[PDB]
């Protein structure tokens, strides 16, 4: 995020880091339960990538992180790679995340909830903060 | 990539308003946010856009696409969860 700020550590508990086997972060995700993660379909996750939970500082080695294996990748079949529409994939964990003070789930909305233009929300992540 | 976790509060926009910036690339299962001085950028993809509702953070959007430049004057585009939750639920249900 550009123009962002540092979050309080562990304050967005559902926030997960998707990392390749090399350990390089390439995409974010959100735990919706102890067994499933929601992410963007275009991230192109595979069974070889890893779901990391409870992380704040990726440079730290003292964090009690949770490296979770990916059992199966459920790419929304309405996803359109040409147009990036329906960009959602579900990742089922092969090992359940252990919920805690720093690892918990985001709430999901009803199909009909209204979220008004003008409302101030929050987005988080480890993406570039400079382009 | 930065080492520690970042965040930013930003406004939701109407699809109709978005389209003044991204035309027809904007679909019903997408929701726009930003153009307010911060922007989602490479590496943020798949991450969340949440809103507070009845005091609980709720996944309204998933970081999808935006400025090739991460411009903070252009809005970010997010997958719209409301349009996706039905599939989310069937998927959990059968797996």
């Amino acid at each position: 995020i550009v123009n962002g700020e540092e979050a309080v550590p562990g304050s967005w508990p559902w926030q997960v880091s998707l990392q390749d086997k090399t350990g390089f972060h390439f995409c974010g995700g959100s735990l919706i339960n102890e067994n499933w993660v929601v992410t963007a379909a275009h991230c192109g996750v595979t069974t070889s990538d890893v779901v990391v939970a409870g992380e704040f500082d990726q440079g730290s080695s003292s964090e009690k992180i949770q490296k979770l294996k990916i059992a199966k990748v459920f790419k929304n079949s309405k996803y359109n790679s040409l147009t990036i529409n329906n960009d959602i994939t579900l990742l089922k964990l092969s090992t359940a995340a252990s919920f805690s003070q720093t690892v918990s789930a985001v709430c999901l909305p009803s199909a009909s909830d209204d979220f008004a233009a003008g409302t101030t929300c929050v987005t988080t992540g480890w993406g570039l903060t400079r382009y | 990539t930065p080492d520690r976790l970042q965040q930013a509060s930003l406004p939701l926009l109407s699809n109709t308003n978005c389209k003044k910036y991204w035309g027809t690339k904007i679909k019903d299962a997408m929701i726009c946010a930003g153009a307010s001085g911060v922007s989602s950028c490479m590496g943020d993809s798949g991450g969340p856009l949440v809103c507070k509702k009845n005091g609980a953070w709720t996944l309204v959007g998933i970081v999808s696409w935006g400025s090739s430049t991460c411009s903070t004057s252009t809005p970010g585009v997010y997958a719209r969860v409301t349009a996706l939750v039905n599939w989310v639920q069937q998927t959990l249900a059968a797996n």
Binding site: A7, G10, Q101, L108 | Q7
Partner: peptide, 10 residues
């Protein structure tokens, strides 16, 4: 869901 144990500060 949706209520962190550690409160976010924005």
């Amino acid at each position: 869901c949706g209520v962190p144990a550690i409160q976010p500060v924005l």
